[PDB]
Amino acid sequence: TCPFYKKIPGTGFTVDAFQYGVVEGCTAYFLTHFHSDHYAGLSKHFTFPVYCSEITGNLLKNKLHVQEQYIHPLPLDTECIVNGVKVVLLDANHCPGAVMILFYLPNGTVILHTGDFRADPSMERSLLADQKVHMLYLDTTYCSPEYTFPSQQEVIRFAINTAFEAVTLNPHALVVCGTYSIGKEKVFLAIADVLGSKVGMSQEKYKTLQCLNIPEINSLITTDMCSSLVHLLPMMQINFKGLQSHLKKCGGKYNQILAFRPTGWTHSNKFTRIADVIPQTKGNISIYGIPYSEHSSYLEMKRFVQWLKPQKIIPTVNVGTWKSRSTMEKYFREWKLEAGY
């Protein structure tokens, strides 16, 4: 059945709740972003109103074939009325089209649902600054102090410099980047820009990227693999066996692969700086795991919450075990005592 942390009190609304069948009492289903654990259940047979960003609504129409009459895209940073309730969509700094949702309840309560987000100080100057938030539905993916990672800018600088050096030393090297969902497009697009190449990919993945309103995208991507020296493949194929096989398909154009796996966190972070990252190598294949995150680090999360000062926090991630739930609640209390709210 639908868990309580997917329901918005005082409304008929749910958030990211498409896999439970007809939720009793639900008049509007919101979708924060186009990732499968959140959209699970949607299809061309869905006949209730879906509220989302313009980019998410492009993906629902083109990839899942949801009918247009049930897609209700909303502009960002704009007060809108849905079934008699004022709502605002804010940029979540996650993947393309991802939003946070502010709900202004008829009784005066204000609720923020972060969806999935990477907290940033720029959020402290949005429409959130303008009123008090009483309840926070929080993406707690990395809510423990072991989770540190570098800025997205530091990670992309590492990736660009590594790829440029490799291909300048060997003009017959191929760069490969893994993917299994939308997000992290900066990784492959920044590398193709430094090399003077388009990114080559499958027709299915090209279709998906063409839904994202990214500027000048026709200039950066292609389905012609032959004309490209940066290839995108499924994340599952980013291993020695999968890469050796791909290199065979390129007909002797290339004699070396340099591959990137943009993971979330991995425990090489507790010790290793970005400067000190090294690949796994076999023969003429090297694989780099880079810590490019689209979720908050522990410290980024803690700064946002201590700024916002909510009266009540409802976690939406890591809620399935008692030890995780109790640990998170202990951090929330530390934060509140340290900041004085």
Where do contacts with Ni ion occur on this chain (CB under 5 A)? 35, 116
Count of residues in the chain = 341
CA distances from 197 to 167, 172, 175, 191, 201 (A): 12, 14, 11, 9, 13
3-state secondary structure of 13: strand
Quote the tokens at residue 113: 């649902």
Measured CA to CA, the distance from residue 86 to residue 70 in angstroms comes to 20
Measured CA to CA, the distance from residue 333 to residue 277 in angstroms comes to 35
CB atoms under 10 Å from CB of 337, counted, come to: 9
Ramachandran angles phi, psi of 33, nearest 5°:
-170, 160
CA distances from 222 to 43, 95, 225, 260 (A): 28, 21, 7, 19
DSSP state of 38: H
Ramachandran angles phi, psi of 230, nearest 5°:
-125, 115
